[model samples]
Target: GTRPLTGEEYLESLRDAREVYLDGSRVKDVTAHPAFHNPARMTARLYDSLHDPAQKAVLTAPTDAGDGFTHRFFTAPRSVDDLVKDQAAIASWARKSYGWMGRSPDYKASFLGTLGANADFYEPFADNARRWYRESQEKVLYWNHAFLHPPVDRSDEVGDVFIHVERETDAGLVVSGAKVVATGSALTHAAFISHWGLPIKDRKFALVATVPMDADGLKVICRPSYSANAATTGSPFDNPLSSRLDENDAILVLDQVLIPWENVFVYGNLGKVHLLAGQSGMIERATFHGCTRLAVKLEFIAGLLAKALDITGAKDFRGVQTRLGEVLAWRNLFWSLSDAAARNPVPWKNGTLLPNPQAGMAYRWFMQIGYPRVLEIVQQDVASGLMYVNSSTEDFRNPETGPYLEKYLRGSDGAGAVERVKVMKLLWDAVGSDFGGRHELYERNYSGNHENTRIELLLSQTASGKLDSYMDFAQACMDEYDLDGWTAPDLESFHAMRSASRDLLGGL
Candidate 1:
């Protein structure tokens, strides 16, 4: 019977000769490399959790195909119970990474899970969608996507700089161009490429497809790796979050890469590319997953913050307590939104139900501001303590300065130097390090760009006739009154009182 990949199988999958470059060197083995080694195993833990009998209840679900069980999020939800179970599974695996890893294998399931239900939206490639939906759900293959063109230019002239189909061939379409920062691509089995509101006009530019990471010409150029930095600088005690949870973003340069016909989900239809986001069911699910994952993240962050406050001896301060409470409020806000989305399922294609996008939309908009605010509170309340730690975990071993750090760096309670540094280092790694800084930028813009988050929310309400209903709602009240008197039949105007008052006060 088919089951998800075991952790060992996931690790072995990365050994496939994928091209990944970092610091001008080709990363030949992602599993063994410093940058991806721990992170890869961290992912493996999630896969391993699926096979465990204890985790089986929450982490895996029966595939709609009826052939085998799969991760809950990888199958379409047909009711609120299904959506709620999906959220539980999402949060379950998120806890595996302590909510730090965002692009878990399940993240892409937001798109893949909908294929069985919305496959027809892909038309001629509908068969491809169905096939992929079955395969991915059964095996739970890890996939990452490069949705946007490189940030080179936005003008209409999308030359070779943008990813485009170069020429057609019997076997496949030859493509060339670059995609920005393919996050977590280095360790994934495949890469999914598609549009994100890009005004794709030409046939070459309008294509949605998947390509194996080991594809001959698909190259990944990674940014500075946080995991590699953590390895170089300190031990896990010093860079806890950065050590294993770095989802490194890379620039994907596709040089005449062959995208086989079997992988194409959408092709040559500009309308399909444009209409994909709204119709795909991917956006709603993505936001729902994001919100659920973020709720878990905030819970981790909130606990970390409260611990930091206690360590700093600010636990009893009135202002500090209020901020900690506010942090809890932020955590609750996201969890509440995720709950609402799951509890209130909306009917969608093929009798499948999607998490209510209204809750998801508010989440997409709130996270941009809320995450940054929480980070700020950490810095604000924790103050200098985030920076007051010793140089590295190695400092505790030094016979010379070990005594000094041990005596001076102990927490207000009976906490020792190692425990205090461990807590502070974790918090610093979250909000102060390069990894933390990148998260701020990521959380602020990832779901939707700053302006577009709001614009799309407006656009969604407008398209759904919700805004028009709001206008008519106001118009309903306006129609009830006029210049001289009440226009509704239910109430009389104060003309009699007005005339009597006019004689006493003299009308103007």
Candidate 2:
């Protein structure tokens, strides 16, 4: 059981009765559908890499569950070295897709990996956590989370609006409600259902559990698939990033779904549900994972942008060069935060370590601004060059149109039309297409709303006494020098100098 699933096994595992809706029709087979096929294959590639000797060293690690080797992040990191390896592993997989797929399996490993060390937080459901931690890691299970409530229903009626237990059953709890934006649910093994950000007054609303993707009454209503749309409108040459890496977001609905007792991590425990964010270590680790992935993604974007700039012959322009540097600065910022989070560890339950949240919180706030600014820089500097290219790869196929495109669209310094158009289209797909727009929104709010990210960052520092320490630091300076003169022993008093200056001024 220690071995992770093979690529074929991973693909075969998805051949279940999970209900996924898209384009006004039920997706018959997610693994074969136009919407999810390539993305599913892309995920399968991650699974297969676990067995590759070259990648195995970085990606796979011994599992505490005694199941076998697993993805490094799926097991709790006990040391800074362990976390450093976790970041590397995350980045390696992210590189496979050029950092486009945000909800890759390692993303949910953020939560599952913490369970082995933090199981006690779930109390009566602690066994459930222990079991899942082992099983998921052993299988390298792909999991997605549906934690936030739908944007509507801002009330506290636990049983009314958000995901709530409608009733109890002999087999399990009968839960009914909706969770917004379950990204990549159709391609996942299970959905981790929980409440986050919102407060709950009723015990019925205080629930955290996992539901199998194929569980009855559970449905995923997905937004339009960028991958599918890319396939429909253009070839991979024109939609390189979108064609294979769209982790489609969906609305998850649980209409009286049966969440077995074994899958329930915390239920009917208002206090524990409220404590989930802090006690579970999910947020801290999730931010760490997200920051690492995003850093890799930005690196990819930065490289692509640089190539685009070169083709447009804007790399030498001073203003364009400055904006490109600005894009790189944003990339550096995220990588720095990710590195800081990994290197500066915080002690968590038992002997396990949590990524330092100070850097993680800083990342959350900065990314909300940084990602959009990076996109804008691409839009601004690339300018008309993004639109100057031919419409599609097909344009190059036409005998008559081909020469016109070749003559008109050839890049500077002998770069051919095909190569130039390819780079520009990829850049446009990344920054200007519908796929690109959603990514901006994802970067903005996926961690938390704009308001909450900042407020929580402020509150977290205050709670940690870091805020008070800043005031005390200023107070130390104030205490050193009174209104009269310097009081600390280290400095010579300038009172005589001030008095001489005052006397001189008075004489004048």
Candidate 3:
């Protein structure tokens, strides 16, 4: 009755008349469109792995129902070992996309994975939670989100811009509004909409729900398609990341979309809606998923940067080596955070354990700084090597440019022009392409905005009383001394030295 879909089935699922518009065209089929086709195949590859004989151990786990196996991230971790496996499974798929894709199917599993274990948080709709948890896990459903209200007028009075329930109906609740930057929504099965702890005085706006991509009035209006642009202008060699790995962020517009009761998790409830992000345990797991994926991404980038340095014959230079080391350190940092999250998880609902939120939260903050630093270091060290390559992969094949490109574009050592261009182009696509820039943006703010990451970290520690604990620790040190003498009997404050200057001044 239940099992994950295979590659073919996943591709077939995408043909379900989901309304996706890109570059002034209704994408007839995501599986066939130039904008999404290759990326869709890339995702299909991820689905295929779930059934791979070799990957079964690392990627698949027995479903909560015990009827079948699903992607490891689809189920809640029962122990540290389970969570460690989850990290491995997340990284394994990430490696498949060479870490370019941030919203792989498993990313949304962060929230879906929590549903089964924390269902009661949804109370009146706890049954919906239980059903979706099983359904999503059983099929390994691919879900992303349109959680943030678009940054329009930024006023409650301009309510039409944000998602709000129109009216209650026995069939469902009629809803309308738009959400921003629904990354990879065009490729997903559904979009989860939540207020994400933003205060809501009106009950209509205080809803946490999921809507299928094919919902009648839901429209996926995408930004310019980088994938389509890549297809038109360059080969895989020139636009490696964008050609097949662009997640293609889109805007989700719900024009009176009717979301049935079964899909509504926390409607008409302000408290549960506010707590949905915190109490449902999405933040902890999502950060864990992002950190793990980024760790893999940095590994890919670190290797690419190192190879480029070698091709330039700068690998032996001390400055180049130092910067290369910095990139690896950034890589090491994210992996350590991912490791910490799994190795030291916290007990959550029932017997399930959530990834260590402390580690995850640390990842969330450090990534905002760490990822940008990695990009800057690449730009610094790689220098013009990013743009030094030939105009396109085609140049090497043209008779006129072939001989000149061979001599002029040749690597410093014995590396050939073709190999050198190949390396530089891959490196360029990683950090210099439009796709690369979006990646920088993604890593900087995907977990949270730059300002919010820091303040939230401060806010988290402050609320946890950890900041108060640190203050009290400083107070304890201060309690040991005063201007006159040591306040405690532990040791002298060396008031003799304090008077020595006074004696010298008196003599003067």
Candidate 4:
């Protein structure tokens, strides 16, 4: 509405009255309710950053037609250069949240936009691919997809997807089923994306439709778990940032809701869902975009850690220095991959931008392994300062303990007692509280699902069975040499080669 709204303003604009029942009663205004309020506000703040003068350059890119910037990365690339530009734009928005909060509406659009922009990349079925893309582009809608169906009503079986319950003549189809773990629907405009790739025996289970959150007979039940818990943290330094970045999570209930012709993405089409999932072309491009965003996110975390170390005056400790080096390595690797992907861009048939899959997936795996260690290092190095706090300014204003507390808790090097207490409070917020734990869990699981996706992607890449061939090659090299006694063929020849080389490997 305004030039740019803060998190508060974003919340004010989300007035869609859905059949949202939380705890017991139906919420009249979810944006104002305690549970949904904070999450909605957090998303709003992120949205507002798109238009912020300083951040707009990062989030908003010019459309080919010279129109003003739209959402940061909703357009599919028409060329390889366009794809690189889009990746840069997504990276800008992602760094705003330090890559901690993945799967924002932008993440979904990142996939949908590519699909919508270039339908030819996907297998065509009754013009299904083309129509879906046009709908997304025309409507400019935001939807969060759930890949796993609910484990409640259906146990151990993955066939609980939204099925076509019945059909009316001229209206449309009636769909009734349930999907759980749906993110951002309380704040989303509609829902009609895939949640499972199960082999369905029945045709009805493969249904997909774009239905609004407030449609008649459709109900959404959400527990305010992450939403309510984040704002309740005791630490102000850390909780303030973490609480505001959490996206809403919920259970979507569909009760024979009718879908108009335009809103349907796929109807009783398992083949279409397969086309969406493993259609190597689109999947590869989407995965590349995901990894690019993650790389950018890690850069932010590494930079923040570096700055934190410098500010804390503990960067030189031996163990801390080792941690800094590890962080730097990953930080450099991430940027290198991002630059490589952008510079050596590829394209799918539909003209969507694609990055190097093996390289991007490798980066994803590195972050998965690196982030926990990053946190562990921080905790180990900064543990002493984060664990305790002496007093605050409000307490210093007191008549009794003010004089005595200041005299005893004061640190060396003329750092004020109040300033030391403040730093401790800040460290506690980053790594000390429940909010920090949630942030860790969230970052680990952000890219639509858990580490399983990355692992599965990695394992799938090794299907050609070349890994063992390389292993045999390694054994051959070892077998050719004597491990016990190393020898040289000619001393003069080796010396001559060493003298001739440029010494690229750093000191021969």
CA lDDT of 42 in candidate 1?
94
Encode model 1's per-residue lDDT on 1-508: one tens digit a residue. 7798999999998998789999999988899998999999999999999999998888898878788888889998888888888899999988988887889999999999999989989999999999999999988989997887776665656477878988999898999988886899999989999887555478888889999999999999999999998898877888889989999999989999999999999888888988988888888999999999999999999999888888788998999999999989999999999999999879998889988889988987899999999999999999899888888866778898899998998897678878888899899899989999999998898887888889999999999999999999999999999998899988989899888988897755
Q: What TM-score fits each model? A: 0.97, 0.95, 0.97, 0.76
Sequence-dependent TM-score of model 3: 0.97
Candidate 2 residue pairs in clash (backbone atoms < 3 Å): 2-67, 2-68
Give every collision pair in model 1.
none
lDDT top scorer = 1
Off by over 4 Å in 1: 153-158, 502-508
lDDT of 1: 0.89
lDDT of 3 by residue, 262-345 (tens): 999988788887777677788899889999999999999899888888888889899989988988998988899999999999
**In model 3, which regions exceed 4 Å deviation?**
154-157, 197-200, 493-501
What is candidate 1's TM-score against the reference? Answer: 0.97
lDDT of 2 by residue, 363-451 (tens): 88898889999889888988888998877777889897999999988898589999998888889899998889889999899888999
The superposed Cα distance between candidate 3 and the true structure at residue 161, in angstroms, equals 1.4
TM-score of 4: 0.76
Better of 2 and 4 by lDDT: 2
Each model's lDDT:
0.89, 0.88, 0.88, 0.61
